[PDB]
Amino acid sequence: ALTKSQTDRLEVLLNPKDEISLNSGKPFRELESELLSRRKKDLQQIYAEERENYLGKLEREITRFFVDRGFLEIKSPILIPLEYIERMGIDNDTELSKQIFRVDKNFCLRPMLAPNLYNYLRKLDRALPDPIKIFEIGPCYRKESDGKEHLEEFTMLGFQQMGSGCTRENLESIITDFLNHLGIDFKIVGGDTLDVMHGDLELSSAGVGPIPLDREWGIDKPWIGAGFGLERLLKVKHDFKNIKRAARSESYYNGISTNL
Amino acid sequence: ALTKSQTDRLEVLLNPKDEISLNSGKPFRELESELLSRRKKDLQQIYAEERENYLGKLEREITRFFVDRGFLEIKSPILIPLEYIERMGIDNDTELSKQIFRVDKNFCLRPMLAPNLYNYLRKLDRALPDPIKIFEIGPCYRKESDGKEHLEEFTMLGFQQMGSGCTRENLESIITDFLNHLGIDFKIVGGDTLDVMHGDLELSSAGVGPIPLDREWGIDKPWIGAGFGLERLLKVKHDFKNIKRAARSESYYNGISTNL
Numbered sequence: 001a002l003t004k005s006q007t008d009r010l011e012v013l014l015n016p017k018d019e020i021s022l023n024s025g026k027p028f029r030e031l032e033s034e035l036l037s038r039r040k041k042d043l044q045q046i047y048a049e050e051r052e053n054y055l056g057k058l059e060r061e062i063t064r065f066f067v068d069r070g071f072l073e074i075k076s077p078i079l080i081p082l083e084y085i086e087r088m089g090i091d092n093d094t095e096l097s098k099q100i101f102r103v104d105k106n107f108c109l110r111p112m113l114a115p116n117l118y119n120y121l122r123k124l125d126r127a128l129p130d131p132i133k134i135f136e137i138g139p140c141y142r143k144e145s146d147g148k149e150h151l152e153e154f155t156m157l158g159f160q161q162m163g164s165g166c167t168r169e170n171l172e173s174i175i176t177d178f179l180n181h182l183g184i185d186f187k188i189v190g191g192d193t194l195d196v197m198h199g200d201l202e203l204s205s206a207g208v209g210p211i212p213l214d215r216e217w218g219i220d221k222p223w224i225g226a227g228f229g230l231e232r233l234l235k236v237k238h239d240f241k242n243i244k245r246a247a248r249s250e251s252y253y254n255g256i257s258t259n260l
Numbered sequence: 261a262l263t264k265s266q267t268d269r270l271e272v273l274l275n276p277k278d279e280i281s282l283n284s285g286k287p288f289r290e291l292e293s294e295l296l297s298r299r300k301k302d303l304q305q306i307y308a309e310e311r312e313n314y315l316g317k318l319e320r321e322i323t324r325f326f327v328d329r330g331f332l333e334i335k336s337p338i339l340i341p342l343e344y345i346e347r348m349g350i351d352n353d354t355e356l357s358k359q360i361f362r363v364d365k366n367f368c369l370r371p372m373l374a375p376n377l378y379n380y381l382r383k384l385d386r387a388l389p390d391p392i393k394i395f396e397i398g399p400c401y402r403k404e405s406d407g408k409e410h411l412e413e414f415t416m417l418g419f420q421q422m423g424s425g426c427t428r429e430n431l432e433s434i435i436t437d438f439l440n441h442l443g444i445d446f447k448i449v450g451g452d453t454l455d456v457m458h459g460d461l462e463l464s465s466a467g468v469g470p471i472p473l474d475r476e477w478g479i480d481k482p483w484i485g486a487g488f489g490l491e492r493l494l495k496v497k498h499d500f501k502n503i504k505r506a507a508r509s510e511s512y513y514n515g516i517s518t519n520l
């Protein structure tokens with residue numbers, strides 16, 4: 001019989017599309033050599049043909065979707081002033097206050113895109129015609145307990161529209177077109193707040209403004225927006241058992257173990 | 261006559277393609293209203309047509325170049341173990357040792373891509389045919405003195421080939437094809453080491469292995485590689501006077517002031 005340590009080793013080499021019975025009679029060394037051969041072949045095929053990383057490719061595909069729908073592509077700082085966290089209403093009572101990676105005395109790694117998106121909406125309202133539609137994709141950081149659905153370093157899509165047309169119906173239409181474009185099953189469950197679920201996994205939280213917090217950011221128009229984790233989208237699309245398979249990582253490439 | 265503070269204000273609104281004499285007789289309020297009008301028009305045109313961010317677009321264009329040349333696209337952690345810095349030979353004597361953004365007790369924001377690229381070359385050598393060609397584009401972080409050519413948060417392209425064909429000629433051919441593809445003037449000046457210059461501005465440092473440091477990373481094959489700053493490429497291509505115009509930023513969008 002396989003030890004638990006041996007099954008752990010085989011599980012890192014197992015891909016969802018495999019159809020191998022680990023619990024059958026075959027010895028560990030033979031099961032391991034078979035899986036090593038397939039994963040090496042998987043990497044050789046990627047190298048010979050497409051050569052694109054799942055996380056980079058997903059970001060490029062989402063970028064094309066939102067640019068084509070009239071949203072301006074934003075690239076804003078990842079290292080942000082610590083004051084932005086408090087100004088978001090994240091005080092000691094909230095969970096997120098304990099999840100911040102602090103840097104130096106006055107900076108942190110952003111755990112969210114909302115502060116920079118607020119700042120862009122306010123500034124662009126002086127220049128662009130109504131409605132203002134923006135989006136950003138990039139790294140975000142949170143301290144988390146170990147869990148199959150959370151990374152400490154992940155990638156967030158955030159989009160926001162401000163001005164006319166900021167209805168819940170329009171928000172649900174964006175989400176619906178977006179996930180049907182990507183081929184990801186979902187249910188929307190519900191200022192108004194709204195979560196996008198895949199089974200028990202949260203793909204997104206979405207919001208409809210105005211809300212009282214807007215005033216602190218110099219915002220006084222209605223808005224709709226949502227934030228999606230890219231690694232969670234990849235986990236669902238590729239049926240990964242653990243989100244570590246979709247992360248920026250030295251241990252996995254497109255969900256394939258790099259320890260061969 | 262304009263005050264220095266007024267000229268500073270006008271300089272943030274001035275774009276390289278403008279042809280306005282600030283030192284002429286026109287009053288500040290009129291020069292400011294003219295420049296505000298043009299920059300608002302510039303943003304409106306981006307929003308109406310392409311809607312792509314210069315830094316995102318450049319990353320996508322570089323990605324296509326290297327994928328098409330047979331390099332595997334890597335996305336590796338930005339928050340890296342602090343031990344990687346020492347293992348790179350960065351001790352107290354080097355400048356880079358004082359430039360590290362530390363996070364928690366044992367992590368830092370990566371100032372370079374070399375450690376993760378080394379780790380990928382070693383792991384992929386067990387799976388991929390010779391030669392192994394990889395590249396990564398993403399955020400890097402260094403503490404810097406104020407200067408028109410440096411950001412504390414920037415974006416690095418790093419590529420590396422390991423195995424056969426790792427000659428200086430082949431390295432110079434990659435660099436030359438790459439920058440002629442982008443339309444960026446350069447001179448290459450010179451294990452062997454090699455810098456890619458635009459006038460007095462360093463676009464890249466490049467290297468040819470083996471070097472003694474490889475052994476610490478489990479590497480024992482020849483290699484060639486180089487690292488390029490994306491914001492410096494944008495600064496040259498768009499003739500920005502200060503690299504702040506090309507950065508991830510809340511103050512500039514595609515080199516256009518957002519404070520209008």
Ligand SMILES: Nc1ncnc2c1ncn2[C@@H]1O[C@H](COP(=O)(O)OP(=O)(O)NP(=O)(O)O)[C@@H](O)[C@H]1O
Pocket residue numbers: 142144149150151152154155156202203204205227228229230231232
């Ligand atoms: N640690 C994380 N790892 C991966 N994705 C994350 C992480 N935290 C948040 N996300 C994603 O970012 C989206 C928006 O962030 P947010 O609504 O603040 O998350 P959240 O409410 O903390 N979700 P959860 O922690 O799963 O209950 C989420 O719906 C997830 O898709």
Ligand SMILES: Nc1ncnc2c1ncn2[C@@H]1O[C@H](COP(=O)(O)OP(=O)(O)NP(=O)(O)O)[C@@H](O)[C@H]1O
Pocket residue numbers: 402404409410411412414415416462463464465487488489490491492
């Ligand atoms: N602070 C920075 N801001 C922007 N680009 C940078 C920065 N540091 C390095 N780069 C870019 O990354 C490339 C490779 O890094 P590296 O060779 O370590 O830089 P460097 O030797 O410290 N250059 P410099 O600081 O200008 O003398 C450089 O050639 C630049 O294009």
Ligand SMILES: N[C@@H](Cc1cccc(Cl)c1)C(=O)O
Pocket residue numbers: 111112113114115117156157158159160205206207208224225226227228
């Ligand atoms: N609240 C998360 C996700 C998000 C982003 C943007 C907009 C909304 Cl409504 C939600 C963040 O600030 O990044």
Ligand SMILES: N[C@@H](Cc1cccc(Cl)c1)C(=O)O
Pocket residue numbers: 371372373374375377416417418419420465466467468484485486487488
């Ligand atoms: N030395 C810089 C630039 C670089 C990257 C990769 C390879 C070479 Cl030769 C040079 C870094 O480690 O990121």
Ligand SMILES: [Mg+2]
Pocket residue numbers: none
């Ligand atoms: Mg959470």
Ligand SMILES: [Mg+2]
Pocket residue numbers: 202204205
């Ligand atoms: Mg949520």
Ligand SMILES: [Mg+2]
Pocket residue numbers: none
């Ligand atoms: Mg330097």
Ligand SMILES: [Mg+2]
Pocket residue numbers: 462464465
């Ligand atoms: Mg250098």
